[PDB]
């Protein structure tokens, strides 16, 4: 409108909102569909749900490879959104009980889920990188605000999805049975609308082309670099001053520098799966903590489950508050938050949140009687301080990570560093699954462990962020 912000990002943030809406509206009904429509084992349903989630987490690698190495982006977004819409069509087609039964339903549902995972993994990094591409490299201050608005759109989509999903699967009969076809078709229409609105802004975008088979060049350059050193019975200059400088008889400098930056950022990101796994162990145990504390609140009775909704709402409140007030106040003085101090401070805040959760659990345990009521029974409040701290950590770490991934990536591989950021979440999710079964510790002792682990992870990231060499 005025300046410094293209009209294009309007059909980027809206698309992201519409996509998250549909994704969270479908994933919510997925498990009920498995259990009460397909009539699957609990083990089978949970395993299929977790496999689908993991594939969704892991596919953005393929999406970013396709985008950067070939076809550019805004063409991988379009085609993978078409694949996403096809997957939604199949999934909603398999929930119709009229045609086929127990075999067409299973096949169509599984194929649709595979296509949905493919689409999501390739709309995730490409859309963020494409929206970032709309700003001139000099406008590095408007890009951060755009990324804040992008995260706000994500969280708003999640919140409206949570608030609107139970209405669709509430006492609706498709054909003499519970209506799952609508529950899966509404997300399909939302995805179709997202694709339409994104395509509507084609003439305004700033589509840049790919810089060649960048992924193959990167792999071959790394392979040559590693292979050169193997001078078992010889060697006078295998590689000095770096492990890539003597992969220079080919792979000109403009590629060696790009792979250097890529490897630097990847080594920096190494520790983030542990942070993601540790911070993901709060939406399950905090529910157990809530179940042990009063939730009448005088005005409105609060069920422990509903407290989960306090995270997206607090993110919505904190994003504008952080960007427009707190960061400006910090900038008032000489204090300089370098986008890596922000992430470390977010990790410290998450550690503090888990320590506060441990303290609240300790207070809960120390109950003694004076239907008998324990005098020292905490209200569902006192869960606010940990929700405030953990939410501020997510705003600082997550919004800063998207910008850091883009600003530090070579132009040839802008969406590959976005896949690297998403790859940490994918690996972190695997850690949660591998460690979920191992649970035999007290709630207070567990939180004091996660707080301590989250501290050690932050010291490792802080030390490696100190020696990081920024891209230039």
């Amino acid at each position, epitope marked *: 409108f005025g300046s410094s912000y293209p009209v294009s990002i309007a059909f980027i943030v809206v698309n992201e909102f519409c996509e998250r809406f549909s994704y969270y509206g479908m994933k919510a009904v997925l498990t009920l569909y498995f*259990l*009460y429509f*397909l*009539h*699957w*084992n*609990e*083990d*089978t349903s949970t395993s299929v749900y977790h496999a689908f989630s993991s594939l969704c987490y892991f596919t953005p690698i393929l999406g970013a490879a396709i985008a950067d190495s070939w076809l550019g982006k805004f063409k991988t977004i379009i085609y993978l959104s078409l694949v996403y819409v096809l997957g939604h069509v199949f999934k909603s087609l398999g929930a119709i009980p009229i045609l086929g039964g*127990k075999m067409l339903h299973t096949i169509l549902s599984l194929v649709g889920l595979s296509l949905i995972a493919l689409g999501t993994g390739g709309i995730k990094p490409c859309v963020a990188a494409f929206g970032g591409d709309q700003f001139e490299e000099e406008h590095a201050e408007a890009r951060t605000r755009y990324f804040s608005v992008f995260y706000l759109a994500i969280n708003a989509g999640s919140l409206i999805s949570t608030f609107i999903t139970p209405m669709l699967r509430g006492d609706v009969k498709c054909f003499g049975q519970d209506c799952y076809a609508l529950a899966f078709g509404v997300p399909g229409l939302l995805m179709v609308l997202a694709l339409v609105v994104f395509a509507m802004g084609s003439k305004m975008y700033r589509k840049p082309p790919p810089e060649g088979n960048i992924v193959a060049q990167v792999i071959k350059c790394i392979w040559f670099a590693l292979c050169n050193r193997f001078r078992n019975r010889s060697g006078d200059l295998p590689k000095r001053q770096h492990w890539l400088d003597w992969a220079a008889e080919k792979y000109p400098k403009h590629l060696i520098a790009d792979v250097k930056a890529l490897t630097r950022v990847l080594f920096l990101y190494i520790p983030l799966p542990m942070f993601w796994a540790l911070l993901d162990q709060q939406g399950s145990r905090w529910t157990l903590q809530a179940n042990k504390m009063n939730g009448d609140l005088g005005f409105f009775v609060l069920q422990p489950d509903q407290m989960q909704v306090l995270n997206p709402f607090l993110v919505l409140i904190f994003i504008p508050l952080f960007d427009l007030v707190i960061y400006r106040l910090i900038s008032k003085c000489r204090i300089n938050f370098s986008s890596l101090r922000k992430m470390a401070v977010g990790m410290i805040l998450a550690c503090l949140a888990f320590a506060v959760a441990a303290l609240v659990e300790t207070k809960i345990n120390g109950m003694i009687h004076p239907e008998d009521i324990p005098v020292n029974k905490l209200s569902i409040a006192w869960q606010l301080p940990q929700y405030v701290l953990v939410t501020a950590a997510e705003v600082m770490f997550s919004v800063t990570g998207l910008e850091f991934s883009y600003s530090q990536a070579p132009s040839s591989m802008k969406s590959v560093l976005q896949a690297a950021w998403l790859l940490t979440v994918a690996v972190g999710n695997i850690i949660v699954l591998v460690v979920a079964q191992f649970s035999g510790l007290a709630q207070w002792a567990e939180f004091v462990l996660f707080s301590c682990l989250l501290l050690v992870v932050c010291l490792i990231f802080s030390v490696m962020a100190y020696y990081y060499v920024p891209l230039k």
Partner: nanobody
Amino acid sequence: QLVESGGGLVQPGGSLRLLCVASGRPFNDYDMGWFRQAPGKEREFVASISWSGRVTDYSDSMKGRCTVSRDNAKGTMFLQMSNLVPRDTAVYYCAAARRRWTFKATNTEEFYETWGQGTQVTV
């Protein structure tokens, strides 16, 4: 393994509370389901309770209101039929299936592999 059952005659609009005790491998390793076989009829699905009792399902009829519970300690399973009628005067069976990965419906006979003998609840 070695499931059992217990129950008997009931009033036209009374209620019944059936038992199913496992006398073998631990009860937490088995998905359980209730079936009925009216005289001169095919076996019908009644209710199903998964391991840990987290997931429960009831037949479309669910005459009145059924409720399946299970305590994996002592391995006992309960079915609470509430508003019985002149119908459903069938022989009620208990079925157990070891946990595994399968795509067969949890509300079908072929899903279950240990059908214990059945009661003779009548109305």
